[PDB]
């Protein structure tokens, strides 16, 4: 959901979805 | 002021205004 995970960069080793957050 | 607070999601129990910040 918004406000429970956070907005950043990337870091080491991050993983990725290939798709777009359903976050709005 | 700008650089005093942190622009942030929300969380448990935050305190609501009903106003805008004065901050621009
Ligand atoms: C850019 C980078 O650090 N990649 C590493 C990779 O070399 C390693 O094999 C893998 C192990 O899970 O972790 C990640
Ligand atoms: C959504 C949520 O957790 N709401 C709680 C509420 O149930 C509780 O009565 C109040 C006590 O100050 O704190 C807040
Ligand atoms: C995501 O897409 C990249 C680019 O095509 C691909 O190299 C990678 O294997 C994909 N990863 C997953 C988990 O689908
Ligand atoms: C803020 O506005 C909401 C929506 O009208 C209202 O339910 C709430 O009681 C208000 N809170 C304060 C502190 O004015």
């Known amino acids: 959901t918004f406000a429970n995970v956070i ?4 870091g080491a080793n991050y993983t990725t979805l290939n798709k777009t957050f359903d976050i709005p």
């Open 7 to 10: 907005a950043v960069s990337r």
